Amino acid sequence: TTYADFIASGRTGRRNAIHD
Amino acid sequence: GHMGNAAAAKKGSEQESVKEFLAKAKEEFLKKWESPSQNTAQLDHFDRIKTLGTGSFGRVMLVKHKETGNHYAMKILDKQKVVKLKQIEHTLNEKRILQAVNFPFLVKLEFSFKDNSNLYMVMEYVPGGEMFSHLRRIGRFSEPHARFYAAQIVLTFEYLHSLDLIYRDLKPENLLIDQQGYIQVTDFGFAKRVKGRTWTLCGTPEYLAPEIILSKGYNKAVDWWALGVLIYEMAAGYPPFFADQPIQIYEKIVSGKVRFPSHFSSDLKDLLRNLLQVDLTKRFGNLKNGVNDIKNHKWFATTDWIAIYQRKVEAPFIPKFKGPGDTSNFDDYEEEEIRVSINEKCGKEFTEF
Ligand SMILES: Cc1cncc2cccc(S(=O)(=O)N3CCCNC[C@@H]3C)c12
């Protein structure tokens, strides 16, 4: 599912801005 | 047409009243911007309680003001680290903006000061936690719940854009929930006064508008794109464009394709296609009718914009609150000292703070 694809992305935690 | 005479007259009057409000708010902002505040407290006026957040920026601590007993969120920045990370202008800009704005959904800066080592911005403590945490815990917000938050962002951006401020940092991580369940926006380091265009590559990958990715000059419309991302993520539980690595996210963002969960209403999908519009010439919030294309969209038909502004709508969700100083809606972090050197650091760089 799309949710499973989201989990697989590894980007489910707090996301940093570019400058970090 | 779509509106009969009474509804059309009421809507027109409401839109004219917005203009009148914003003209006064701009006058007030510019007066405060011309003549700020500074050095309004010191470290030993507060008891340090607990660390509520950390980052490359520094830390945010819950503190209690000794004289009043009021709790606050104190953001502590290490001057030498700010310099090393090339964030001098952003830090001074954040303070100047926070000092000058006034809106029910923008966090209030109560004190600021500096010492030999650090800069301190003392803001109202917003005890309900980050929208991010609640969203990941609940999974996704219902459309009415997402709409309640979205309306607050729409009004906040309508305010900021009237001041020529582009926000550029929207995401659930940067939205806090207050005791009454309303949003507080807090981070202004990347915000900029831009009447026309600007060019800096900044923001968070999932929330970047295509024109930023594509290294174009861009304008306030990037904030309306980001609103589309936020609404989508609130209602789906995940953002519209994701992948393992930012470069793959950017390819999806610029493609002009977006897909929706089957549970999204048709009204929601229509709004999102008009916010997540790659073509600037067609994006809602960037057309001749401005913010009205968003506020008058069918998905917001049940929204009483003045009632939201007045905070008279019952919030769909009230965070847990056991009393002043309750920190349970925030994570736990390792507690570190705040050392201040006997030698002033970076005095020249931060002279205006
Ligand atoms: C805990 C908290 C609580 N109350 C007010 C706050 C004001 C600003 C930042 C925070 S904060 O959430 O610590 N915080 C850190 C800054 C970087 N962006 C994420 C977020 C806005 C507050």
Domain extent, residue B97, equals 36-129+321-351
Assess whether B186 and B125 both reside in one domain: no
List the resolution, Å: 1.4
The shortest C-alpha distance from B59 to chain A (Å) reads: 15
Chosen from B89, B229, B242, B253 to mutate, greatest number of chain A CBs within 10 A: B242
B134 and B219 belong to one structural domain: yes
Sign of CA dihedral B3, B229, B85, B331: positive
Half-sphere exposure of B51 (CA within 13 A, CB side): 13
**Considering only CA atoms, which residue is closest to atom 19 of ligand 1?**
B174
Q: How many Cα atoms occupy the beta-carbon half-sphere of B30 within 13 Å?
A: 9
DSSP 8-state assignment for residue B55? E
Look at residue B9 and tell me if it is in a domain.
no
Q: How far is Cα B93 from Cα B81, in angstroms, rounded to an integer?
A: 17
- Chain B residues whose C-beta sits inside 8 Å of any chain A C-beta: 55-56, 85, 87, 132, 136, 169, 171, 173, 190, 201-206, 237-238, 242-244, 259, 261
Q: How many whole angstroms separate alpha carbon B150 and alpha carbon B152? A: 5
Strands in B118-124's sheet, in edge-to-edge order, are B46-55, B58-65, B71-78, B118-124, B109-114
Question: How many residues comprise chain B?
Answer: 353
> Does B335 fall in a domain?
yes
**How is residue B335 annotated by DSSP?**
-
CA of B107 relative to ligand 1 center, distance in Å: 9
Same-domain check for residues B62 and B210: no
Contacts with B48 (C-beta within 8 Å, 6 or more apart), sequence order: B61, B62, B63, B74, B338
B201/B168 Cα distance (integer angstroms): 10
Residue B87 inside a domain? The answer is: yes
Q: CA B44 from chain center: how many Å?
A: 30
CA dist., res. B157 & res. B153, Å (int): 6
How far, in Å, CA of B284 to CA of B297, rounded? 10
In the block, residue with structure tokens 């090393």: B84
CATH of the domain at B105: 3.30.200.20
CA B349 from chain centre, in angstroms, equals: 27
Active site residue B326: no
| Residues after which chain B is discontinuous, using a C–N cutoff of 2.5 Å | none
- Write down the H helix ranges in B190-239: 210-213, 221-236
E-strand ranges in chain B read 46-55, 58-65, 71-78, 109-114, 118-124, 165-166, 175-177, 183-185, 192-193
d(CA B81, CA B86): 9
